[PDB]
């Protein structure tokens, strides 16, 4: 495969089956549903008819009163006492197969390549810890919203993008399938592509 850069204008030979392969849509949807559904902490709780602060004495007689039968004030048909199926804190975190995660990352790398969105550069870092430099610098390449993903993270580059909105600078260990779609361009170090070729495999 021919990853030609745009600044050094050099080829980069990677695995066709890893990188220039098919795009399975309904797998990528599965990993993004399972990932965003892994993002939920899900700390909801209501209370049933056994936690409402009340009593258990029947409000009135069973028979002879004109009113409908009722047995507890905590019943879920009454006001202020209720929630027949009250929800609890749960785990919405759902499991993927490992090969579907790695494979679907290979598929979205394929889709980012065939759309001329994924950008390979060589070693690409900032010089001083100042976001002013990254403003001109990402003005120059015409990069509005990116994923500056590198293989060696430092205090120089990461601090210079902690306050940019549309910029997220990750470690090549930590790419995730909602970012590689949720950014408009992606720019990579050649070392970062060198590692993602290994990890996705």
């Amino acid at each position: 495969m021919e990853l030609v850069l745009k600044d050094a204008q050099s080829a980069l030979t990677v695995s066709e089956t890893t990188f220039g392969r098919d795009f399975n849509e309904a797998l990528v949807h599965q990993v993004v549903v399972a990932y965003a559904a892994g993002a939920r902490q899900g700390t909801r709780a209501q209370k049933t008819r056994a936690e409402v602060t009340g009593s258990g004495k029947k409000p009135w007689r069973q028979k002879g009163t004109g009113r409908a039968r009722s047995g507890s004030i905590k019943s879920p048909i009454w006001r202020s006492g209720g929630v027949t199926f009250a929800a609890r804190p749960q785990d919405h975190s759902q499991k993927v197969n490992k090969k579907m995660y790695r494979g679907a990352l290979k598929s979205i790398l394929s889709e980012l390549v065939r759309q001329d969105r994924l950008i390979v550069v060589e070693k690409f870092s900032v010089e001083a810890p100042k976001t002013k430099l990254l403003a001109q610098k990402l003005k120059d390449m015409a990069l509005e919203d990116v994923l500056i993903i590198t293989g060696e993270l430092d205090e120089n580059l990461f601090l210079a993008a902690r306050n940019l909105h549309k910029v997220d600078v990750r470690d090549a260990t930590g790419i995730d399938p909602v970012s590689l779609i949720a950014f408009d361009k992606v720019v990579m170090t050649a070392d970062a592509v060198k590692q993602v070729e290994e990890m996705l495999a």
Binding site: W60, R61, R67
Partner: peptide, 14 residues
């Protein structure tokens, strides 16, 4: 109403 009285007894029929 808090106090609901016992209903007026039925006509026998037994």
């Amino acid at each position: 109403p808090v106090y609901i009285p016992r209903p007026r007894p039925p006509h026998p029929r037994l």
